[PDB]
From a paper:
β-lactamases inactivate β-lactam antibiotics by hydrolyzing and “opening” their signature β-lactam ring. In serine-based β-lactamases of Class A, C and D, this hydrolytic process is executed in the deacylation step involving an activated water molecule carrying out nucleophilic attack on the enzyme-substrate acyl adduct ES*. Here we report structural and computational studies of Class A β-lactamase PenP with Glu166Tyr mutation that analyze the interactions between this critical water molecule, termed WAT_Nu, and other components of the active site during a full cycle of hydrolysis. In summary, by analyzing the reaction intermediates observed in the active site of a Class A β-lactamase hydrolyzing a β-lactam substrate, our study has uncovered critical features within the active site that coordinate and activate the water molecule for hydrolysis.
In the active site of the apo structure, the mutated residue Tyr166 adopts the same conformation as the Glu166 residue in the wild-type structure but the bulky side chain of Tyr166 extends much closer toward the catalytic residue Ser70 and forms a stable hydrogen bond with it (distance ~2.8 Å). The Glu166Tyr mutation has little impact on the overall structure of the active site as nearby residues like Ser70, Lys73 and Asn170 adopt essentially identical conformation as in wild-type structure. Notably, the key catalytic water molecule, termed WAT_Nu for its potential role as the hydrolytic nucleophile, forms totally six hydrogen bonds with partners including the side chains of Ser70, Tyr166 and Asn170 as well as the mainchain carbonyl of Ala237, the main chain amide of Ser70 plus a possible sulfate ion from the bulk solvent. Compared to a similar water molecule observed in the wild-type TEM-1 structure, WAT_Nu in Glu166Tyr mutant structure is located closer to Ser70 and Asn170, but farther away from Lys73. This difference is probably due to the bulkier side of Tyr166 as compared to Glu166, resulting in WAT_Nu being “pushed” away from Lys73 and toward Ser70 instead. In the apo structure with ES* absent, WAT_Nu is coordinated by a network of hydrogen bonds involving Glu166Tyr, Asn170 and Ala237.
Numbering used by the authors: 31 to 57, 59 to 83, 86 to 238, 240 to 252, 254 to 295
The structure:
């Protein structure tokens, strides 16, 4: 009942799914409960981008304007005059959670409806992309627009990063971006022992939604793929990163990973 205890300590709802790809062992807590996916969708969106382009095609320069900027544009706001390549957009999106970068990438693959179709093609019938930033963060309880589940996000992230939805050189680009994410140090990363490599993508949205999805490599062994999702009752709720860090610690102990 440690996940329940965390829900109690943090006045939140948790959604957990974790798969040890070494043993096929699984840790689940509300694994099929929907949450707003928030910026975790950025990781899947780059998976789809990568599928649709050669590596060299990522060097395509995307010109854009001030009207492409939205609520959080840490990288894209600096390069309006020069544009940015698709590769640079992917970097910004994954490593800084640049919202305008996600929108520009979405545009290049044909929009939310197109993303949805490519996700269905790789076998995800759950994740429901419908809107761009900033609106995709606004999901009320019981709505399904721009939501997914912990099980579906783990399944989809594994498929792109570790299985055969991408060729090895494209898996490597995705993995390396997510390993070097700047936004996640207080989340899954904080619940895994020092030195263990972590690839992650965070998210935050309305109703105090606070998410992280990750691949976690022990020093030797097959990786664990994990989604820790959370949300709260009030629309303007605050979140606490420590919830996600502590949930991760529970998952790691439940998988017999602390230590090795």
């Amino acid at each position: 009942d440690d996940f329940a205890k965390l829900e109690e300590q943090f006045d939140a709802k948790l959604g957990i799914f974790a798969l040890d790809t070494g043993t096929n062992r699984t840790v689940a807590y509300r694994p099929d409960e929907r949450f707003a996916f928030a910026s975790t969708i950025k990781a899947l969106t780059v998976g789809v981008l990568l599928q649709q382009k050669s590596i060299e095609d990522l060097n395509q320069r995307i010109t854009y304007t001030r009207d492409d900027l939205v609520n959080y544009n840490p990288i894209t706001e600096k390069h309006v005059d020069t544009g940015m390549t698709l590769k640079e957009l992917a970097d910004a999106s994954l490593r800084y959670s640049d919202n305008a970068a996600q929108n520009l990438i979405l545009k290049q693959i044909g929009g939310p409806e197109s993303l949805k179709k490519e996700l269905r093609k790789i076998g995800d019938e759950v994740t429901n992309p419908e809107r761009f930033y900033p609106e995709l963060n606004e999901v009320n309880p019981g709505e399904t627009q721009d939501t997914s589940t912990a099980r579906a996000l783990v399944t989809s992230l594994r498929a792109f990063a570790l299985e055969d939805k991408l060729p090895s050189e494209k898996r490597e680009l995705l993995i390396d971006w997510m390993k070097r994410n700047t936004t996640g140090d207080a989340l899954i990363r904080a619940g895994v022992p020092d030195g263990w490599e972590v690839a992650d993508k965070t998210g935050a949205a309305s109703y105090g939604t606070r998410n992280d999805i990750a691949i976690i490599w022990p020093p030797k062994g097959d990786p664990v793929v994990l989604a820790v999702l959370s949300s709260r009752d009030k629309k303007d709720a605050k979140y606490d990163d420590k919830l996600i860090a502590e949930a991760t610690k529970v998952v790691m102990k439940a998988l017999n990973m602390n230590g090795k």
